[PDB]
Design a protein around this motif. Structure first.
Motif, short mmCIF file in Angstrom:
data_model
loop_
_atom_site.label_atom_id
_atom_site.label_comp_id
_atom_site.label_asym_id
_atom_site.label_seq_id
_atom_site.Cartn_x
_atom_site.Cartn_y
_atom_site.Cartn_z
N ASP A 1 -3.65 4.07 -2.77
CA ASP A 1 -3.72 2.63 -2.57
C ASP A 1 -4.46 2.06 -3.77
O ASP A 1 -5.59 2.46 -4.06
N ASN B 1 0.87 -1.17 0.00
CA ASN B 1 0.00 0.00 0.00
C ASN B 1 0.90 1.22 0.00
O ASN B 1 2.14 1.09 -0.03
N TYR C 1 -6.44 -2.89 -2.61
CA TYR C 1 -5.27 -2.96 -1.72
C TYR C 1 -5.37 -1.91 -0.63
O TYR C 1 -5.98 -0.86 -0.83
N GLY C 2 -4.72 -2.17 0.51
CA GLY C 2 -4.65 -1.17 1.57
C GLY C 2 -6.01 -0.65 2.01
O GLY C 2 -6.90 -1.42 2.38
#
Ligand SMILES: [Cl-]
Length: 254
Positions: free
Chosen positions: A44, A23, A48-49
């Motif tokens: 991000d 991230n 993701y993240g």
């Protein structure tokens, strides 16, 4: 929605895209150095993240989402998987991309005829392994990225800390990201980008073989490259000073 952050107050905008399984926090180590020279836009990637609510996506689908709330105009810098997203952005919205920078990234991560890379069966193995050994598999892929360097141990810990500091993405997302790596080949498409195109590599990178650098210097004559001698797959972590200097030189050359 996709998580975006702005940091710094520099007179040139710079988008930073992280790699698979990570991230935007991977960029923490270079923020301060860069922030007077660039206004940073940290994202991000979708899935993701902090960018929840997305599933598996192709590179085309992923880049279109990233483009939505990205700055109007910026240098686009992508690390590893992020390099494919930056490249696709340059191919789709060239007027929004002042320069394309890839770091420790390949236009075609999988080995093919006459082309060095990762055996596609290895990537397929990671995909299969995500189903029953989810956490260790993610960590095993990341552990490949810091090998052979002066700071290998510290740098592997840095990446593992980034992973562990946020909830894990869905298996669907992670499997889809490996599928992008395994299947995308931008070698021919990228011949046609005309903005400045700088490719940074680590000499010791075990995922993106340094052998591709002269192949691509020739295939992409308008581009340029720099190999960091003692860096592996995360040159901005192992060699932040040299990494930032490359970006200064680029900025001055626009
Ligand atoms: Cl990656």
């Amino acid at each position: 929605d996709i998580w975006w952050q702005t940091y710094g107050e520099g007179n040139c905008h710079l988008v930073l895209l992280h790699g698979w399984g990570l991230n935007a926090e991977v960029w923490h180590c270079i923020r301060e150095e860069l922030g007077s020279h660039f206004t940073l836009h940290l994202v991000d990637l979708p899935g993701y993240g902090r960018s929840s609510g997305f599933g598996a996506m192709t590179l085309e689908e992923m880049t279109a989402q990233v483009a939505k709330n990205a700055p109007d105009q910026a240098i686009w810098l992508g690390w590893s998987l992020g390099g494919l997203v930056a490249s696709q952005m340059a191919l789709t919205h060239p007027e929004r991309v002042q320069a394309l920078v890839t770091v420790a990234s390949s236009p075609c991560f999988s080995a093919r005829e006459g082309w060095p890379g990762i055996k596609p069966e290895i990537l397929g193995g990671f995909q299969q392994q995500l189903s029953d050994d989810f956490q260790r598999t993610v960590e095993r892929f990341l552990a490949l990225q810091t090998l052979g360097t002066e700071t290998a141990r510290q740098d592997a810990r840095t990446l593992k800390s980034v992973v562990l500091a946020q909830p894990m993405p869905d298996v669907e997302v992670l499997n889809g990201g490996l599928e992008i790596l395994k299947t995308v080949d931008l070698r021919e498409a990228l011949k046609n980008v005309n903005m400045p195109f700088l490719r940074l590599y680590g000499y010791l990178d075990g995922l993106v073989p340094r052998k591709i650098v002269p192949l691509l210097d020739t295939l992409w004559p308008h581009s340029t490259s720099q190999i960091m001698a003692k860096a592996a797959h995360a040159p901005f972590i192992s060699h932040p000073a040299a990494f930032c200097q490359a970006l200064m030189t680029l900025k001055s050359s626009l």
